[PDB]
Each structure stands twice: as C-alpha cells, then as structure tokens.
Amino acid sequence: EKDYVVIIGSANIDVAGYSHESDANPGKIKFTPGGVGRNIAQNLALLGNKAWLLSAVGSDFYGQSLLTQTNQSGVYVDKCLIVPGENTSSYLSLLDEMLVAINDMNISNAITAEYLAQHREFIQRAKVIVADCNISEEALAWILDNAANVPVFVDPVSAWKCVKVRDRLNQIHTLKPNRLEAETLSGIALSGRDDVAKVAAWFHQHGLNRLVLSMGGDGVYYSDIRGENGWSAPIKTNVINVTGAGDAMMAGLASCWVDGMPFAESVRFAQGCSSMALSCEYTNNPDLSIANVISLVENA
Amino acid sequence: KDYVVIIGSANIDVAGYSHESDANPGKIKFTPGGVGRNIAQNLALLGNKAWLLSAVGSDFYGQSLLTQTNQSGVYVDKCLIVPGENTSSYLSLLGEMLVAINDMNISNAITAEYLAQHREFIQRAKVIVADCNISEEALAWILDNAANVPVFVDPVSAWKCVKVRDRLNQIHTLKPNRLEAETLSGIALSGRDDVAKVAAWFHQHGLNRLVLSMGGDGVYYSDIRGENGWSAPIKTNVINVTGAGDAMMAGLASCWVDGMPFAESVRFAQGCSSMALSCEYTNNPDLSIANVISLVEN
Ligand SMILES: O=c1[nH]cc([C@@H]2O[C@H](CO)[C@@H](O)[C@H]2O)c(=O)[nH]1
Numbered sequence: 001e002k003d004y005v006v007i008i009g010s011a012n013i014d015v016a017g018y019s020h021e022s023d024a025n026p027g028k029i030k031f032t033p034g035g036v037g038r039n040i041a042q043n044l045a046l047l048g049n050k051a052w053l054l055s056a057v058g059s060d061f062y063g064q065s066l067l068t069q070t071n072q073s074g075v076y077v078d079k080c081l082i083v084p085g086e087n088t089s090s091y092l093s094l095l096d097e098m099l100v101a102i103n104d105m106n107i108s109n110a111i112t113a114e115y116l117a118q119h120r121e122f123i124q125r126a127k128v129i130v131a132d133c134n135i136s137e138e139a140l141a142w143i144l145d146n147a148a149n150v151p152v153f154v155d156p157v158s159a160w161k162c163v164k165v166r167d168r169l170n171q172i173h174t175l176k177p178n179r180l181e182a183e184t185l186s187g188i189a190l191s192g193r194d195d196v197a198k199v200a201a202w203f204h205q206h207g208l209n210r211l212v213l214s215m216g217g218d219g220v221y222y223s224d225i226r227g228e229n230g231w232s233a234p235i236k237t238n239v240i241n242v243t244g245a246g247d248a249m250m251a252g253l254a255s256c257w258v259d260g261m262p263f264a265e266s267v268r269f270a271q272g273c274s275s276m277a278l279s280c281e282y283t284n285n286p287d288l289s290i291a292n293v294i295s296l297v298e299n300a
Numbered sequence: 301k302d303y304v305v306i307i308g309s310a311n312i313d314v315a316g317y318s319h320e321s322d323a324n325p326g327k328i329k330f331t332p333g334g335v336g337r338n339i340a341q342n343l344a345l346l347g348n349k350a351w352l353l354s355a356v357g358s359d360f361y362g363q364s365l366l367t368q369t370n371q372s373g374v375y376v377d378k379c380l381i382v383p384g385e386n387t388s389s390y391l392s393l394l395g396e397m398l399v400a401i402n403d404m405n406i407s408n409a410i411t412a413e414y415l416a417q418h419r420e421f422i423q424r425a426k427v428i429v430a431d432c433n434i435s436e437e438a439l440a441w442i443l444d445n446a447a448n449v450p451v452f453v454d455p456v457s458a459w460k461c462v463k464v465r466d467r468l469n470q471i472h473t474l475k476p477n478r479l480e481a482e483t484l485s486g487i488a489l490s491g492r493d494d495v496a497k498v499a500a501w502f503h504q505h506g507l508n509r510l511v512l513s514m515g516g517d518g519v520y521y522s523d524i525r526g527e528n529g530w531s532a533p534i535k536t537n538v539i540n541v542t543g544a545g546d547a548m549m550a551g552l553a554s555c556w557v558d559g560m561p562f563a564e565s566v567r568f569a570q571g572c573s574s575m576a577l578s579c580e581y582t583n584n585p586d587l588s589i590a591n592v593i594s595l596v597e598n
C-alpha cells in the first residue's frame with residue numbers, strides 16, 4: 001500500500017546508568033533509542049504503519065547508529081537530517097528511581113521550517129502527521145500552516161515544551177496532554193476529576209478539535225469539539241517501565257485514526273498500547289502489535 | 301608490512317555536564333574510550349599499523365565505536381562483536397567529577413580462546429600492548445604465547461593492576477602510576493626517595509623495564525640492566541587529564557618499534573602525554589611524531 005504517516009520530532013540516545021553498591025563505582029549502563037517523535041514513529045511501524053521520521057541527528061557516528069537501529073524496527077529514516085559537526089541529542093539518567101537527569105537536545109533546532117519545506121509535498125501527502133513539541137515554535141507553526149488538511153496529531157512532550165501549542169489549538173486535530181500539561185496550557189487547575197469538563201471546554205473554546213487528556217490513575221478523559229466526551233478507566237498493568245507509555249498511546253491514537261476507528265474505541269486501543277509499553281523493560285515494546293493490544297484489551 | 305597489536309578494552313565514554321546546577325539541561329558527550337582502544341588510536345596517529353583485538357556488543361553503538369576507531373587509522377577488523385551483549389561504557393557526571401559508573405563486563409569476552417584464534421597473527425606483531433581490563437586468564441595467555449614479541453602492559457587501575465604481580469618476568473615494559481606501583485610492590489611511595497627501592501622490588505621480581513609516572517614529580521624509569529633516571533614533567537596547560545597515560549603508553553611502544561633508546565623513548569612518551577593533556581578529547585586528533593618532536597625540542 002502507498003499510504004504512510006509522517007512523524008516530525010526528536011530522536012535521542014537515552015543513556016541510563018544504574019549504580020550498584022551505591023568516586024567510580026561499577027554499575028550498568030544502557031544505551032537505547034529515545035526521543036518522543038522517534039519513539040512514536042517506532043511504535044507506529046510496529047503497529048504496521050508505513051512510518052517516515054523527519055528528524056535530526058549529528059555526525060557523531062552514534063547518530064548514524066540511532067538511525068540504523070530505528071530503521072531496523074521498521075521506520076523509514078532516509079529523509080532525516082544528519083547535521084555536520086553537531087552531537088546527536090541525548091537523555092541521560094542516573095538511577096539507583098531516577099536520581100538525576102540531563103537533557104541535551106539543542107540539535108532539535110536543526111529541524112527547521114526550511115528542512116520541512118524541502119519535504120513539503122511529501123508531508124502534504126501523508127495520511128496523518130504527528131508532531132512533538134521538542135521542535136521549535138517556528139517549525140511547529142510551519143507544520144500547522146502547511147498541513148494542507150492532513151490531520152496533525154501533537155504530542156506536548158512536557159509542561160515546559162507544551163506552551164508553543166497554546167495559540168494554535170485551532171490547527172491541531174488531536175492533542176494528548178497529561179494533567180500538568182493541560183493545567184499549564186489552560187491555566188485551570190486540575191485538582192480532581194470534577195475539573196476536567198471545564199478544562200476541556202477551555203480547550204474547545206480555543207479551537208481544539210479533539211482532546212485526549214491522560215490523568216494517570218484517574219484514567220483518560222477524551223473530548224471532541226462536536227460534543228462526544230467520556231472517561232476511559234485505566235488498564236491495570238504491572239508497571240515495569242513508565243518511559244514510553246505516552247509515546248505508545250500517541251502512536252495508537254494516530255494508527256487507529258488512520259485505520260478508520262471511532263474516537264472512543266481509538267482511545268481504549270491507545271490505552272492498550274500504553275499498557276504494553278508500561279509492562280516492558282524498554283522505552284519501546286518490540287512485541288507491540290495490533291494482535292497483542294487487541295488481545296490485551298478484549299481481555300478486560 | 302610491520303604492525304603492532306593492541307589487546308584491551310573498547311568503551312563508549314559518556315560525559316554529562318549538569319549546566320545550571322530533576323530534568324536539567326546540560327551537555328552530553330559520547331566519545332571513544334577504553335585504555336586499549338585509546339592506545340591503538342594513539343599508535344595509528346603516531347603512524348603505526350595498529351590492530352585492535354577487543355570486544356564490543358551488538359548494540360549498534362558498538363558497531364559505530366568500531367567505525368569511528370577505524371576512521372582514526374586503527375585496523376578494527378579482528379575485534380569481536382558479541383551477540384546479545386552491550387558495549388562496555390564509562391559514564392561520568394561532571395566542573396570536577398561528581399559520580400562515575402563503570403560498566404565493563406564485556407571485557408570478559410576477550411578470551412584466551414578468542415586470542416588463540418589469532419595466535420600466529422599476534423606472534424608476528426613487532427610489539428604487543430595489553431591492558432589490564434582483560435581477565436587474568438587472557439593476560440596469562442598473551443604472556444605465555446608472545447613468542448619473544450615484547451609485551452608492553454598498561455596496568456589501568458590500582459584494582460586491575462594486581463593481575464600482573466606474579467608475571468612481571470614475562471612483561472617487557474610496565475607503566476604503573478604511583479598508586480599502582482605501591483599496590484603491586486607493597487612499598488609506599490611517600491616521596492621521591494622511595495622509587496629506587498620500589499624499582500629494585502620490580503626488578504627482583506623479574507620486570508625488564510619500569511616506566512613509573514609520579515604525577516608532578518615526573519617519570520622515574522628503570523631498566524633491569526642498570527640504567528635508571530628521572531625525567532621532569534613537561535610544563536603543560538592541562539585541559540583534560542583523561543587519555544594522558546594512554547598517549548604515554550602509545551609513545552613508549554611506538555618509540556620501541558622505531559628503534560629508540562629507553563631514556564629518549566621516555567621523554568618522547570612524555571611529550572605524547574602532554575599533547576593529550578592540553579587537548580579537549582581522550583585522544584588528541586593532532587597527535588603526531590612531528591608535533592611531539594616539536595613539543596619536546598623545547
Ligand atoms: O525534552 C525532552 N525530554 C525527553 C525526551 C524523550 O522522551 C522519551 C520518553 O517519552 C525518552 O526517550 C526521551 O528521550 C524528549 O523527547 N524531549
């Protein structure tokens with residue numbers, strides 16, 4: 001089939017260092033593919049979609065390895081950028097539960113409007129576009145201004161990076177904030193479940209088509225500007241690794257949209273994807289598939 | 301058609317610098333590391349045909365470590381890619397160093413069986429450099445099968461050096477720092493007054509040549525045949541101390557292979573160390589005979 005999805009976002013090398021026996025201590029150090037956009041792209045390939053990553057890595061060899069590893073999970077990485085003389089962005093975590101974390105993502109800024117415009121007609125012929133908020137405001141504005149009626153799904157990434165979305169909700173098809181992100185955007189505290197209707201009305205008054213609000217233990221509240229809303233309860237999971245849960249949920253939303261699925265069922269399915277990510281030791285679960293998510297959901 | 305063989309570990313060093321002081325912005329640098337791998341790179345840069353015998357895992361980042369190493373001149377074609385293992389790494393949080401993690405278990409994949417599959421190739425090298433990251437069995441194998449090829453040994457750390465203690469009579473040149481020499485000999489190196497005694501210990505235990513680096517005090521060198529002396533440090537603007545010992549070791553082995561006398565080899569080696577010290581990286585990209593000679597003649 002000649003249908004594809006375009007993901008525009010960041011590709012990181014995650015580095016986790018675990019202390020044992022808590023100067024130079026022995027321990028375990030794991031390099032993994034990371035970055036919200038790259039992760040999403042990988043989950044979409046595993047969900048069986050033709051996925052193209054538009055992203056940036058540097059010439060530091062390890063950048064090329066990141067791309068290669070990503071390509072092997074199914075992702076089309078050929079249009080990605082290899083920036084001369086820059087380092088490949090990275091997310092470093094010192095664990096024991098995370099003690100300290102460093103965030104080195106300046107190369108995100110190389111994902112420019114000029115870069116994207118050189119692939120304009122290719123982006124405009126995608127079935128859906130997914131964008132994360134690691135990219136600059138100019139680059140996100142470019143995507144939203146040139147989507148040519150292709151739905152743009154936006155992953156807000158963090159309370160800090162989500163704000164670039166506030167003035168452009170009327171250009172985003174589906175937004176998936178967590179509690180802190182939705183509070184930051186709307187300026188309305190999400191104290192309890194009682195507050196979500198008000199926060200959702202805020203998002204829709206500001207032009208957002210569809211809100212997928214994840215509220216942790218409280219579940220997911222979903223709301224469509226056309227009137228449909230509801231709560232979906234969490235899928236009980238024994239959680240091994242929370243990293244990648246949101247990336248899984250975003251991938252499942254977009255895949256379900258492209259597959260022709262209704263909103264409420266797409267949200268439940270997305271929750272299942274997330275659940276698969278949660279019970280896996282990795283940022284992405286290699287066993288994520290329509291089959292297994294369907295099996296995980298129907299058994300509930 | 302002459303070459304040098306280096307047997308040791310190949311790491312990815314990761315330096316994370318906390319910037320403004322949770323998820324903190326900062327800088328994270330991935331670089332090639334590992335004593336053996338570093339030495340091999342310095343030897344290629346000094347113009348020698350250098351072959352690395354080492355182990356990396358199948359984690360893609362391993363393959364690129366090899367590729368980057370190769371790009372610096374090193375023949376990486378005989379290295380091991382261990383299925384379903386991770387590439388060893390040295391993680392550092394820095395500003396001075398706060399914490400550092402050491403993940404080097406793949407070192408154990410550099411086995412006696414592995415080396416024996418390249419036995420005749422190792423036995424035709426001009427010199428063999430081995431680091432003490434490898435297991436005691438693997439180091440014993442090298443020393444037992446060097447077939448009269450000189451083995452230069454980098455002791456790596458006070459912890460890892462001890463595997464050398466019972467086999468000094470098989471090692472051509474050993475390059476310990478103060479702490480390593482103290483750990484091996486059991487003789488404290490309190491002041492300069494102690495080196496003669498430490499050196500006599502090493503020679504009574506069969507070591508051919510000692511190159512003892514004493515930090516600020518310089519380098520003390522001693523040959524079992526009688527020659528010994530102090531060489532004063534090369535006054536350097538130190539930017540990055542990582543890699544200084546690896547440059548010094550490379551320079552010793554290169555100078556030996558080049559036919560140089562001991563004392564001149566030590567001065568030259570110090571110059572290499574100096575180039576490494578004044579550089580931002582674990583290896584200086586500008587390391588060369590030309591530049592070391594030019595640095596030394598002053
Ligand atoms: O600011 C950011 N921090 C962390 C990530 C990545 O989130 C992944 C989990 O969702 C994780 O891989 C990290 O690299 C990002 O893309 N932007």
Ligand SMILES: O=c1[nH]cc([C@@H]2O[C@H](CO)[C@@H](O)[C@H]2O)c(=O)[nH]1
Pocket residue numbers: 309311312313332333334335336338389390402404433456457460542543545546582
């Ligand atoms: O036990 C060890 N710690 C650190 C290193 C490496 O030393 C390099 C500097 O000499 C540095 O690259 C590290 O990887 C090693 O090989 N073994």
